[PDB]
């Protein structure tokens, strides 16, 4: 894969190789596959929902008896 | 039989009408669907089906606050026609809400005031709940009570205002619409209660143990003072107020309608029930400058009027001897020309707790509001924040080009300015 | 200034 | 190794329901407590006497340190493997030949193991029969059956246990008395069957017609189902304490007065709440000191409500009791009910009508309005 | 509602554009077909502000895509949401403009105008009620900076009561890859001054720096370079399309940072940036965006905000938060930080929350900052324009299409009074 | 109308101090929740005494507990009885006092007394008539003879007419749980002899031999030792909340005990004591007890009254009993040991009978005694200080802090001055 010997920011490289090792040849070059950006960036767990959960729908509720 | 009109006008009365309408509907126990499962008759209005409906306008400019209560838990309650919204805000400037967008739709409010306070068999007078710091909420007041005392002649009208923090800040132009507005309500209103966003960040803290507050922690806290001051016309005591007494009872003189409001006690419910509630020890914490909810010191200042709501079980032996031993303390100074300066109202309801709140159930209560010549210092520091902005003739452009002149930037000025003489004037001994 | 009990407890005017 | 349990506890100031977390070590049998809301610890780890394993199931009541906690939750998934998933909860019935020996049945599922969460005896309508028997509709003896469970009153008992539905079926046996005999005498329906059609017992087979059964029998829906046989005339009141029913003397209590030979017109299980008890012992407020020991001990748990019919075979009820202390019952009156079932004056396992005039009264509060 | 009329012009405003297209769907739950997808009715409520609606429940957006060469529009159509942008909104010239000012502005960019102030008019008219206009260029080429800037002038001049944004490519001078944008750059902020209300200035050592000290990427291409602008570009509007507790519009910030009116050039920053590998152990907090928002570091622009003093700074807030810690926080370093802002106004910082933070995060808050130290970015292609206009070099390509020579003394005559100015004000 | 007010600090002082509140608490028959669960009326005529009422019929108690780590303060709040103190009570810091002398009472508890008296000055201000103060603390430490000395001095200012009342753990001889105990012992000394009207001094060792011999206990955890303490300090002042034949408040244990301003360090008791297995073959009746009250291994110090004399003895006798054989009997006392009791003193000895035994035993006795023998527990505090102070060890953490040397040589010569009385009156 990628990272195997221990120089030049090999954790990072070991951390992410299953994001940016998805190609098998079919596309030449890592930056030709990802030209319109990484998979992940800026966030993770990638299938994640909008919450519901606003400050006033929270906050008044109907008051049970 | 005596009915209040409520008027919620910016962003700050929308989201304190959410939490102040929330207590009025657990008052009298009446549920978000609108039925109940006289005392009422003051915020709801009888249907014949059985149907409460509340008598408040809810104004802004930006719907972007009200589309949250009309799809709240509240939506089936607020008639369709009490929440008026505008298209655009008016964008954090005073003449946007005062000439150009603030105009378009006033005709509408005062077409719904109209029908209702002809509903109304006897009207008390108006409460208004407003920001100075916001476009909508400076501007479009400005221009709506002079638009209401026009038309309904010698009514009251009780203000209740958020002014800004001393540090604590929102916006950044929030000198000019400070200054701006004070020009106008200074001859069309009658009392002032005035809070902030400081304060209350203080004693959340340090009374509620709330270490990381919201404005719905804030929002019931003002909630829980505009419920004890409406408390005697609701529920009867063994001596009532009204809103056209501590009109009579708090301000001397035309130009000085500006008392401070405070409420005690303000405790959680794991502290309250180890502590014992005397009605002395919550008289004696409205007075400690450490409860007040306004970020002001009156000890460099001097009480000039006085006014002391009650709640609960409370006996008229008690309060009499509370008030004795405030006479004698040293550290409270009274002018030399109030030698009475208290009233006292008492309700026997004890204050309702709210489920999810923080407050505790209590069994009694009190919320004074004292006219004092320490809120000079208050707006020392502002007016001093106008001089040092409008030297160098900032953002005055945004205000031209509008509609509104220049020449109304120096004219509030000089209004301020002879404001700030009147009131060591006042507090000078005879 | 005084702490007010129940009656009971023997403190204050308990008697009348 | 410990348990965890979610707990509630009403503040009586506040009316605050309030969540705490308990954990037990069943290991050397110490608590302690830990607030959810605040996340600070309420009580160190204790050695308390009073609280044992078998007292902990989800739904029950312990006072701990004078605070009566109910456990609504299960922890954690390591309980909730190994408390939750062996129990299991079945219906029993006791037949009208099996009234007399009821005691002894109740005696025989307690030396099972089986906890007793409710408990009716009742008469059985012609519907109800009906509803009861829907899977015997294709009537092989069906006239002769619905005879037999409508002629008399049945007794139907919620009991819970480790493999419930198996060690029940196992405990009648055949439904032939004869067959159940020859087989294994030790079975119930074998002891205590005169003939196969007189089984003087039923059990259910699965999951779903058992719940049907609870369905029919013990709405969940709070409304009345079958009538209750309160006779309302000439009787007498007398509860079983909650902890008696907890120890497993009922049977006990059943036989020895069944052995007596007082009728007993009518019998329930009801968990009370501190209001309804208060207003139950109200006559004994301001008599005596422990009014609030008595209230507490009645509503520590779930009480077994009694009807006593004609209290006259040799005495009345209130003697047959005996003293209210049991020391002084064991040295004076050897043969009294008290002296045999009591501990403490405070639990002292029945409760009699002290006054003649107050029994009826007892009776309309208990199988009246209540129920 | 308030509708948001974006505009692309250029090659680097259409592959910014692209991607700026792509976040916002991804906000929406909007997919690359056209439908929606998504679970909760907070994203369906206010969507009429960036996509429009069609039958069959299809959204598109209301941008124009403008290019005087179609080389880049089938890059644009054959991307992942290439089928989503409407076939009439892609206006396109035959030829290019060849990092030339003057043949974009004056020649070849003067028939094109045509077709698309067609095409917005139509657009700004099918709007209930219109916000502003939001628009993506590059000062260092010939289509954005020559053509992109022509547009300005002549929006402004029809709509006259409404707000413009531009989210214009600053050059920078080690990542020069044009060698006459000097005279492009000089050119298009004398169009820019009078025009606009406010402008982001973006530049590519700014970019280039962060994913390599805080993203620790190996290969940065320019879709990780356009992600970062794109997340500022919904950062600005989010409290336009969702709920909160206190919300601020565009023409909210323009009125609180431009205390005057030759003073709108902002340059801006995003808060929550870390490594893939510091995703699990940093714990999100809001002292812990407010310290990655003022660091130099984090900020997306090549000067450094220590060489200047700051005017006036906006923070929009995102997430399910408490307003004691957002307000201690920016009252806080207003204390320590008590030279780095000027002492002529006070209470300097906006504060904007909202509710809804983006898709697999939780807090997230954009900064906007007017600064004087901008004027660093002025001088330097100052005196890049004086070098040559010493020496006449390239003028043979600008003085052939029809402009004259005073149109270059001029454009460094009022771009050397905007550096007088902001140092003025400094002091 | 006789109010006492307690104060807890340090570790030794808190464990004690929290073990006072189930014995009280039983005897007035008041739930772990707050309410009163108990059985008689007698127990709730006089309980503002300790309690405080609150709304709802709960009851709270009148101590304030400091200590400046919040590890033991978490320790007492999560204990059986913990739950009913006031929150507000709790005043706590965030640094250890690293069992310091001078960080208890200079630095690191400098700025902690502001807020400790603030509390206080709250509880003695809404009682109606003040009796005294019990503060429970250690000699050993730097914490509760840090801030235990440090608020004596400082109330005493406020509250000069009063009875300030400690129950104080002093160091032992073989025990020697702390390294700097002698340096830490004779700081304290020298100003409880100044301004405290009474105190009653604990030994380690004694309460240890008591549990071994008396009691026969195998096991002698911490959970017994402070409930032999706890007996005395709830028998020394039943006489101010329960009716008795001859009543006897703190300030008539003051004037009857103390000839003298220095000589007012007691050595405590309790007597109905007895083991497990001899329940059966002892007889209950007082003059039983009386030999119990005067037996050397029964007192709570390790000093052997037969090598000393007696200045003033005094008893509180509990429960229904006579009162001519409690007189004759322990005036038959002082007659056969007349050479013990002084010459100069005539009627050594006060009886005080109550009509209240404690919970379950229908007797009690607590020995409270003034003698002259307890100058060895002051002699061998004073030799142990002389032998690490002539090579000044471990004083570059005092002298570190801001105090000076010679405030040591003025407190091992007062206390010098201590030992020298008890002789010249012997
Ligand atoms: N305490 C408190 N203050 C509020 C609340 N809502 C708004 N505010 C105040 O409102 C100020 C912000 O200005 P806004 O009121 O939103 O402005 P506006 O009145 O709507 O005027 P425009 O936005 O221009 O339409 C803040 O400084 C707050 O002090 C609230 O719910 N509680
Ligand atoms: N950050 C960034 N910069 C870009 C991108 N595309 C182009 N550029 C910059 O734009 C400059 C060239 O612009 P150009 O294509 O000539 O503009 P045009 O002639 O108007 O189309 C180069 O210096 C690039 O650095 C992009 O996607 N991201
Ligand atoms: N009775 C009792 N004595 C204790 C306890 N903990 C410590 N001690 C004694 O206190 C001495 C040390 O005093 P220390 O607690 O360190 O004083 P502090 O630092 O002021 O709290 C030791 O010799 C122990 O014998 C306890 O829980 N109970
Ligand atoms: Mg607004």
Redesign the interface.
């Given at each position: 894969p990628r990272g195997q010997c221990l120089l030049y920011n090999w954790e990072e490289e070991r951390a992410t190789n299953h994001l940016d090792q998805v190609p098998s040849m079919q596309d030449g070059s890592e930056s030709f596959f990802f030209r319109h950006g990484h998979r992940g960036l800026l966030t993770m767990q990638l299938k994640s929902p909008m919450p519901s959960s606003t400050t006033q729908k929270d906050s008044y509720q109907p008051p049970g008896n | 039989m005596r009915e209040c009109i409520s008027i919620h006008v910016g962003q700050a009365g929308v989201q304190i009408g959410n939490a102040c309408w929330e207590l009025y509907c657990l008052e009298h126990g009446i549920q978000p669907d609108g039925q109940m499962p006289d005392s009422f008759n003051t915020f709801f209005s009888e249907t014949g089906a059985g149907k409460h409906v509340p008598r408040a306008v809810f104004v802004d400019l930006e719907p972007t606050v009200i589309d949250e209560v009309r799809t709240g838990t509240y939506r089936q309650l607020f008639h369709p026609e009490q929440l008026i919204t505008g298209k655009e805000d008016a964008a954090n400037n005073y003449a946007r809400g005062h000439y150009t967008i603030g105009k378009e739709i006033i005709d509408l409010v005062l077409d719904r005031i109209r029908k209702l306070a002809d509903q109304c068999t006897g009207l008390q007078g108006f409460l208004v709940f407003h920001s100075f710091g916001g476009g909508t909420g400076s501007g479009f007041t400005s221009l709506l009570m002079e638009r209401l005392s026009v038309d309904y002649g010698k009514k009251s009208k009780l203000e209740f205002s958020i002014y800004p923090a001393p540090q604590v800040s929102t916006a950044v132009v929030e000198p000019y619409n400070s200054i701006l507005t004070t020009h106008t309500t200074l001859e069309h209103s009658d009392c002032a209660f005035m809070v902030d966003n400081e304060a209350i960040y203080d004693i959340c803290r340090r009374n509620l143990d709330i270490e990381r507050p919201t404005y719905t922690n804030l929002n019931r806290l003002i909630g829980q003072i505009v419920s004890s001051i409406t408390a005697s016309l609701r529920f009867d005591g063994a001596l009532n107020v009204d809103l056209t007494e501590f009109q009579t009872n708090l301000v001397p003189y035309p130009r000085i309608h500006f008392p401070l409001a405070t409420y005690a006690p303000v405790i959680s419910a794991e502290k309250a029930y180890h502590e014992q509630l005397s009605v002395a020890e919550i008289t004696n914490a409205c007075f400690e400058p450490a409860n007040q909810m306004v970020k002001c010191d009156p000890r460099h200042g001097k009480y000039m009027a006085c006014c002391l709501l009650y709640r609960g079980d409370v006996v008229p032996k008690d309060v009499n001897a509370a008030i004795a031993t405030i006479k004698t303390k040293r550290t409270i100074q009274f002018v030399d020309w109030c030698p009475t300066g208290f009233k006292v109202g008492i309700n026997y309801q004890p204050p309702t707790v709210v489920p999810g709140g923080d407050l505790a159930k209590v069994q009694r209560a009190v919320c004074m509001l004292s006219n004092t010549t320490a809120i000079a210092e208050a707006w020392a520091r502002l007016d001093h924040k106008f001089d040092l902005m409008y030297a160098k003739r900032a953002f005055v452009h945004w205000y031209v080009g509008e509609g509104m002149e220049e020449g109304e930037f120096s004219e509030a000025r000089e209004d301020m300015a002879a404001l700030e003489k009147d009131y060591e004037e006042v507090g000078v001994d005879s | 200034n005084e702490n007010t009990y129940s009656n009971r407890t023997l403190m204050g005017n308990w008697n009348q | 190794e410990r348990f965890v349990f979610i707990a509630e506890w009403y503040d009586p100031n506040a009316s605050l329901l309030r969540r705490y977390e308990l954990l037990f070590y069943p290991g050397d049998g110490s608590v302690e407590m830990h607030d959810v809301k605040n996340h600070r610890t309420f009580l160190k780890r204790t050695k308390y006497d009073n609280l044992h394993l078998e007292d902990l199931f989800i739904g029950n009541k312990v006072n701990v340190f004078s605070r009566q906690l109910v456990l609504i939750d299960y922890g954690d998934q390591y309980t909730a493997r190994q408390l939750g998933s062996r129990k299991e909860k079945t219906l029993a019935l006791i037949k009208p030949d099996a009234i007399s020996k009821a005691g002894e049945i109740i005696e025989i599922i307690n030396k099972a193991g089986f906890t007793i969460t409710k408990l009716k005896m009742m008469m059985l309508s012609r519907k109800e029969a009906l509803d009861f028997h829907v899977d015997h509709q294709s009537r092989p003896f069906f006239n002769e059956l619905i005879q037999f469970i409508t002629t008399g009153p049945i007794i139907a008992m919620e009991i819970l246990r480790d493999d419930a539905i198996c060690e029940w079926k196992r405990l009648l046996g055949p439904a032939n008395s004869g067959v159940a005999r020859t087989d294994a005498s030790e079975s119930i329906r074998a002891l205590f069957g005169t003939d196969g059609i007189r089984n003087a017992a039923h059990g259910p087979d699965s999951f779903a017609s058992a719940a049907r059964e609870m369905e029919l029998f013990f709405p969940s829906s709070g409304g009345c189902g079958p009538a209750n046989t309160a006779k309302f005339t000439n009787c007498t009141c007398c509860i079983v304490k909650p902890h008696a029913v907890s120890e497993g003397l009922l049977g006990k209590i059943l036989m020895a007065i069944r052995d007596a030979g007082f009728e007993i017109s009518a019998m329930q299980m009801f968990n009370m709440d501190r209001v309804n008890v208060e207003e139950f012992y109200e006559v004994y407020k301001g008599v005596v000191t422990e009014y609030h020991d008595m209230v507490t001990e009645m509503y520590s748990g779930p009480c077994v409500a009694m009807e006593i019919q004609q209290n006259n075979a040799t005495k009345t009820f209130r003697e047959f009791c005996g003293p209210a202390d049991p020391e002084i019952a064991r040295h004076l009156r050897p043969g009294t009910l008290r002296a045999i079932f009591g501990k403490t004056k405070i639990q002292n396992a029945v409760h009699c009508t002290d006054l003649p005039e107050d029994g009826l009264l007892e009776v309309q509060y208990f199988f009246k309005i209540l129920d | 509602?308030?509708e948001i009329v974006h505009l692309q012009a250029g090659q680097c405003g259409n592959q910014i554009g692209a991607?700026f297209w792509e976040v916002i769907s991804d906000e929406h739950?909007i997919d690359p077909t056209g439908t929606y997808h998504?679970?909760?009715?907070?994203?369906l409520?206010?969507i009429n502000v960036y996509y429009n609606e069609a039958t069959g429940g299809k959204y598109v957006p209301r941008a124009v895509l403008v290019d005087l060469e179609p080389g880049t529009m089938d890059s644009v159509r054959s991307?992942?949401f290439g089928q989503i942008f409407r076939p009439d909104n892609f206006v396109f010239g035959q030829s290019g403009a060849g990092n030339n000012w003057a043949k974009g502005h004056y020649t070849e960019g003067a028939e094109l105008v045509d077709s698309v102030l067609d095409v917005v008019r139509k657009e700004a008219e099918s709007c209930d009620?219109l916000?502003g206009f939001q628009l993506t260029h590059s000062l260092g080429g010939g289509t954005g900076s020559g053509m992109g800037t022509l547009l300005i002038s002549k929006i402004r001049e029809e709509y006259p009561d409404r707000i413009m944004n531009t989210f214009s490519v600053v050059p920078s001078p080690k990542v020069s890859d044009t060698v006459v944008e000097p005279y492009n750059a000089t050119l298009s902020v004398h169009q820019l001054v009078e025009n606009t209300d406010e402008t982001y200035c973006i530049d590519n050592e700014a970019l280039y720096d962060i994913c390599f000290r805080t993203?620790?990427?190996?290969?940065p291409?320019?879709?990780?370079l356009?992600?970062?602008v794109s997340?500022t570009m919904s950062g600005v509007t989010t409290?336009?399309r969702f709920?909160?507790?206190?919300?601020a519009?565009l023409?909210?910030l323009?009125?609180?940072?431009?205390?005057?009116?030759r003073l709108h050039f902002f340059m801006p920053g995003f808060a929550?940036?870390t490594?893939?590998?510091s995703?699990?152990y940093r714990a999100l907090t809001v002292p812990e965006l407010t310290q990655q928002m003022f660091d130099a570091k984090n900020m997306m622009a090549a000067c450094d905000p220590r060489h200047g003093r700051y005017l006036?700074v906006a923070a929009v807030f995102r997430g399910?938060?408490?307003?004691?810690?957002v307000?201690?926080q920016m009252?806080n370093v207003q204390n320590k930080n008590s030279s780095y802002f000027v002492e002529?106004?006070?209470?300097?910082?906006?504060?904007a929350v909202c509710?809804?933070?983006?898709?697999?995060?939780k807090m997230s808050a954009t900064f906007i900052g007017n600064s004087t130290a901008i004027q660093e970015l002025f001088k330097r292609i100052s005196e890049q324009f004086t070098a040559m206009f010493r020496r006449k070099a390239f003028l043979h390509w600008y003085t052939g299409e029809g402009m004259d020579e005073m149109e270059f003394t001029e454009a460094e005559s009022n771009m050397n009074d905007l550096v007088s100015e902001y140092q003025q004000?400094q002091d």
């Open positions: - | - | - | - | 509602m308030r991607k739950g998504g679970d909760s009715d907070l994203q409520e206010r991307g992942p009620c916000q993203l620790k990427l190996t290969t291409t320019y879709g990780d356009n992600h970062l997340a409290c336009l709920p909160g507790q206190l919300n519009d023409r909210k323009a009125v609180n940072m431009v205390p005057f009116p929550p940036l490594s893939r590998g995703q699990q006036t399910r938060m408490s307003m004691k810690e307000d201690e009252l002529w106004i006070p209470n300097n910082v906006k504060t509710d809804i933070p983006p898709r697999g995060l004000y």
